[PDB]
Amino acid sequence: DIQMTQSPASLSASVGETVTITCRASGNIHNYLAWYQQKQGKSPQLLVYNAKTLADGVPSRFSGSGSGTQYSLKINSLQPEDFGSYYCQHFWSTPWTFGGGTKLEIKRADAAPTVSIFPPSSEQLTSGGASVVCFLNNFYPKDINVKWKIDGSERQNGVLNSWTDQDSKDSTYSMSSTLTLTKDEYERHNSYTCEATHKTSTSPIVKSFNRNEC
């Protein structure tokens, strides 16, 4: 009947830094709190149980504390293998709720996305469909929003967005946004644009093509 509010949803850190993730119970849990670690593509693994007892095989740079409603997970000397997700869970009362999680990622310098827009392929037009694609690559941080405008009017339906993980080599992020239209509609319109909204600008990074202006 108690919920956990975990913070931050995202933490950017470097190797060697100290870091803390917090979870506040919406009720008193009497230290019946556990911390889980979840690596990319793996099952969750217990880190700390009963707020402060380290789980099996968990190193000492890890430590949990608090009581009542505010708990904290601290990682003293961030090692490369610490990057991943953390989740808190209370086991005070049914339901044993998980906090929303924290994604610990490698921080680097900001980088605006390289945006590229692509009109539908003729092999798709021939088929009755018409997908406009926008690649917004190599940006940092990972927060970003794209919006499509067909002749100035925003379009929300028919959009397929996909994001990559933080790159292993350069630590940037990337996103793909496909706007699927029918050939019918794609041919009774001219301007097609996608606007990227990212922290590196106050203006959207915008790309666009005009169907008959080729």
Partner: protein
């Protein structure tokens, strides 16, 4: 030692019902609580409920009260998750874990459940050619839309393997029963459309392997 073996992926369609198994070895399930946890693509862990094998007692998160029925068979050291009236909301990874109050905490590999009316469809691979202010740069990006297939996976390459980096293959996303993915590629403007660039995708489940040269539009 200890291991919780969960089914591999299970494919089911809307409205249907599924019963996932979780088989335990290295310990007796009566000595702990057997949990079931959901995780949608790139979202958080959600506790569904648990069972106390010994007593049979079960507990649930009111969100899953009408969707989930967890049971256990001590005879076989196994726990189950019965999900009913499947919806696209039910597609996720389902973990089973054995734990209660101490250090004893073990998790299964997860059962990825995909919910779709779809039948094994091949992908439509279309080449993505540039809107020019970007070919007009030091480097240009091109791509390939791998649309409308089912089920995962597909593999993608550029210039057969001669183009391994400057590439970004986006994770697939199931909408209206079918998946779709994309792959991007960055090469210098001196290298295209002068020299060629082709993507090669493969969807084992359809026995499909296409190739596609990126050619400039009338631009």
């Amino acid at each position: 030692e200890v291991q919780l073996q969960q089914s591999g992926a299970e494919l089911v369609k809307p409205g249907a019902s599924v019963k996932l198994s979780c088989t335990a070895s290295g310990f007796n399930i009566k000595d702990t609580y057997m949990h079931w946890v959901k995780q949608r693509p790139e979202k958080g862990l959600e506790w569904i409920g648990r069972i106390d094998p010994a007593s049979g007692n079960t507990k649930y998160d009111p969100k899953f009260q009408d969707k989930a029925t967890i049971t256990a068979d001590t005879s076989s050291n196994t726990a189950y998750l019965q999900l009913s009236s499947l919806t696209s909301e039910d597609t996720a990874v389902y973990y089973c874990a054995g734990y209660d109050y101490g250090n004893f905490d073990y998790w299964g590999q997860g059962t990825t459940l995909t919910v779709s009316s779809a039948e094994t469809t091949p992908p439509s691979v279309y080449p993505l050619a540039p809107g020019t202010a970007a070919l007009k740069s030091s480097m240009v990006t091109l791509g390939c839309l791998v649309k409308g297939y089912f089920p995962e996976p597909v593999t993608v390459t550029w210039n057969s393997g001669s183009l391994s980096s400057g590439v970004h293959t986006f994770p697939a996303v199931l909408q209206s029963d079918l998946y779709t993915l994309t792959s991007s590629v960055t090469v210098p403007s001196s290298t295209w459309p002068s020299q060629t660039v082709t993507c090669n995708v493969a969807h084992p489940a359809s026995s499909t392997k296409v190739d596609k040269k990126i050619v400039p539009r009338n631009c």
